[PDB]
Design a protein around this ligand. Structure first.
Ligand SMILES: *[C@@H]1O[C@H](CO)[C@@H](O)[C@H](O)[C@H]1NC(C)=O
Ligand SMILES: *[C@@H]1O[C@H](CO)[C@@H](O)[C@H](O)[C@H]1NC(C)=O
Ligand SMILES: *[C@@H]1O[C@H](CO)[C@@H](O)[C@H](O)[C@H]1NC(C)=O
Length: 148
C-alpha cells in the first residue's frame, strides 16, 4: 500500500503480532501503529527497501488477514463509507480496532448477504446516530430508521 519512511517525530508505542493480534507496548515490530501528523493511526508493515542508494526500511499500510485475531473491530469502512461494527457484519476493506488503529483488511463492500455499503444505494439508515446508505439485492435492513 502507501509507504512512508519513519520520521523522528513518530512516537511508535504499539506493536501487533501479525497472526495472533496480541497488542504490546513497544517501539519496534513487524507491524506497528503509525500516526502520521494529523492522520488517523494505521497499522503498518515494516518493509525492506533501497533508498538513496542504501538499504533501508519503510512502513506500508499493507493488507492483513485479521481472522485469526479472534476479536472484532469497533468500526469498518469500505467504498467510501465508515460504519459502526455490528455483530453479523462481514469483513469490509478496512477495520478500526478500539485501542486505536485502522487495519487494511481482506474484505470488500458487502456488509451482509446481498447488502452493500454503497454511496449510490437505495436505502438510507443509521447506526447509533451514524448515517449510512445501503444497496440491497424479503431483505433485512441491518440498521435503524432515520426517524427518531
Ligand atoms: C491494502 O494493501 C494492499 C497491499 O497489500 C494495497 O494494494 C491496497 O491499496 C491497500 N488498501 C488500502 C485501502 O490502503
Ligand atoms: C483469512 O484467514 C482465514 C483463516 O484463518 C480464512 O477466512 C481465509 O484463509 C482468509 N480470508 C481471506 C478473505 O483471504
Ligand atoms: C447501536 O444501536 C443498537 C440498536 O439500536 C444497539 O443494540 C447497540 O448496542 C448500539 N451500539 C452502541 C455502541 O451503543
Amino acid at each position: 500500500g502507501s509507504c512512508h519512511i519513519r520520521q523522528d517525530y513518530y512516537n511508535i508505542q504499539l506493536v501487533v503480532e501479525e497472526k495472533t493480534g496480541v497488542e504490546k507496548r513497544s517501539i519496534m515490530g513487524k507491524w506497528s501503529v503509525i500516526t502520521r501528523e494529523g492522520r488517523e493511526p494505521k497499522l503498518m508493515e515494516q518493509i525492506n527497501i533501497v533508498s538513496n542508494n542504501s538499504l533501508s526500511e519503510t512502513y506500508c499500510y499493507n493488507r492483513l488477514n485479521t481472522s485469526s485475531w479472534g476479536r472484532q473491530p469497533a468500526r469498518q469502512r469500505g467504498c467510501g463509507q465508515t460504519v459502526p461494527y455490528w455483530p453479523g457484519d462481514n469483513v469490509l476493506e478496512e477495520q478500526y480496532y478500539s485501542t486505536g488503529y485502522w487495519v487494511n483488511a481482506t474484505g470488500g463492500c458487502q456488509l451482509r448477504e446481498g447488502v452493500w455499503l454503497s454511496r449510490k444505494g437505495n436505502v438510507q439508515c443509521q447506526r447509533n446516530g451514524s448515517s449510512l446508505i445501503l444497496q440491497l439485492a424479503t431483505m433485512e435492513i441491518p440498521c435503524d430508521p432515520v426517524e427518531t
